[PDB]
Amino acid sequence: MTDRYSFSLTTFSPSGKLGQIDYALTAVKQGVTSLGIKATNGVVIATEKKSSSPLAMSETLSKVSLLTPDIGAVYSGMGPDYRVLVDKSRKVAHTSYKRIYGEYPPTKLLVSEVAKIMQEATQSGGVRPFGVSLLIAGHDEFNGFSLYQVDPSGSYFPWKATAIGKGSVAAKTFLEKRWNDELELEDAIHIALLTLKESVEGEFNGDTIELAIIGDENPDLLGYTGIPTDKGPRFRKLTSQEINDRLEAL
């Protein structure tokens, strides 16, 4: 018994390709489109809620996940792989940072830790790479707002705006035309909804679209009052109703 697979399942081919990473990226290509746009006073991450069955309750399945109060994540590719990454990402933020410095990690460093986890699945014994690309949006005091993309290889790149998955090629071209360095958060949400409508085929409403923002602090969502320095989470998931309001003035 015991894990006898102590050797790499991802190896270099004669041409220099890492097969499993390439194939994992193929799995990401098949995945549903998600995107991220960085504004001057916030970031927006969005994706389509592909329902497996109309009897299924798509509210119970959350594609956009809070990692820290000021960092959110969305993905394209294999949902189960994403779910466990979010679990590990949430924990590493605590173990390797908050329990040491008494504050939440800045976006770039949390991203770095997630990348490390995905890189190890590329080299460690008896494991395949993760079949997802992440888009991590976040804010921190000294870097401000930021948006990162993390690939199955463990590589990560900062973006002004981007899209991953099914119709990423067309979506990226759409974003290049619309993005400027003076976009306000509400303008970015508007563009996000426009870009996403291109890739979505069926219903397009607040129940089939999942969308969150990294913006201003939300004291109402903090849960307590009395500490002035604690001002609430910058991450906020837009409600089904809040999305439909913006779809009328679309």
């Binding site: 006898r4 102590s6 050797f7 014994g125």
Partner: protein, 240 residues
């Protein structure tokens, strides 16, 4: 832990991984060892497809294991560092428990044992390295030159060469080295070593390294000009 038996017997009774490690040695730059009446000289080829090198800081081909023993090699450069490090640690460990520096035979025997262990241990491949180990035992003026190889066998040599085109320079040494009368002086020994490398090398410029080891921890590396004088002298006598 990774357990795989990588070095294994084949139907004809060969351990291919050990034999393929010898091919890596054959690819490596030539190294030669010649021992005289009162000295040993280690000569080493350095390939000249690398210009813009920084020779101050580039790892030298001949390494000191202790103040009285040296080690040159042919084959994989990265592999050789692991053997050298282990040998250097064992050298200090021997001084610590025996209160006497290692003999050249003992040090060689240790390095050869390490190489052997990597031929029947799970999860590891053999060292793609053959070494020439030279020096003088403590309080002894008799020169010592030993050779090791990936399989783990080791032996003493009056003169020997390893690496690429070593069979050519071994041919040279076999007729030019007299057992009854080894190079009586340092000059004679260095010249015979340089001559033997000039059969294979190309130019006698920054392609040849020479290190001379004498008794009682007397080791010095020759500079370009010093070596170049031997190259100049040999070529003028050749035109005859």
């Amino acid at each position: 832990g990774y357990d795989r038996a990588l070095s294994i017997f084949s139907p004809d009774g060969h351990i291919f991984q050990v034999e393929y490690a010898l091919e890596a040695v054959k690819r490596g730059t030539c190294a030669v060892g010649v021992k005289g009446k009162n000295c040993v000289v280690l000569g080493c080829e350095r390939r000249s497809t690398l210009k813009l090198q920084d020779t101050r800081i580039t790892p030298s081909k001949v390494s000191k294991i202790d103040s009285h023993v040296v080690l040159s090699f042919s084959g994989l450069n990265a592999d050789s560092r692991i053997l050298i490090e282990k040998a250097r640690v064992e050298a200090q460990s021997h001084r610590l428990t025996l209160e006497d520096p290692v003999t050249v035979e003992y040090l060689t025997r240790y390095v050869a044992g390490v190489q052997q262990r990597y031929t029947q241990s799970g999860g590891v491949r053999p060292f793609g390295v053959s070494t020439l180990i030279a020096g003088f035992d403590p309080r002894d003026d008799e020169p010592k030159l030993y050779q090791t190889e990936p399989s783990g066998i080791y032996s003493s040599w009056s003169a020997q060469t390893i690496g690429r085109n070593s069979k050519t320079v071994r041919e040279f040494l076999e007729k030019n080295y007299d057992r009854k009368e080894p190079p009586a002086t340092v000059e004679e020994c260095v010249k015979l070593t340089v001559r033997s490398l000039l059969e294979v090398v190309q130019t006698g410029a920054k392609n040849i390294e020479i290190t001379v080891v004498k008794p009682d921890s007397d080791i010095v590396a020759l500079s370009s000009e010093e070596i170049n004088q031997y190259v100049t002298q040999i070529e003028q006598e050749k035109q005859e």
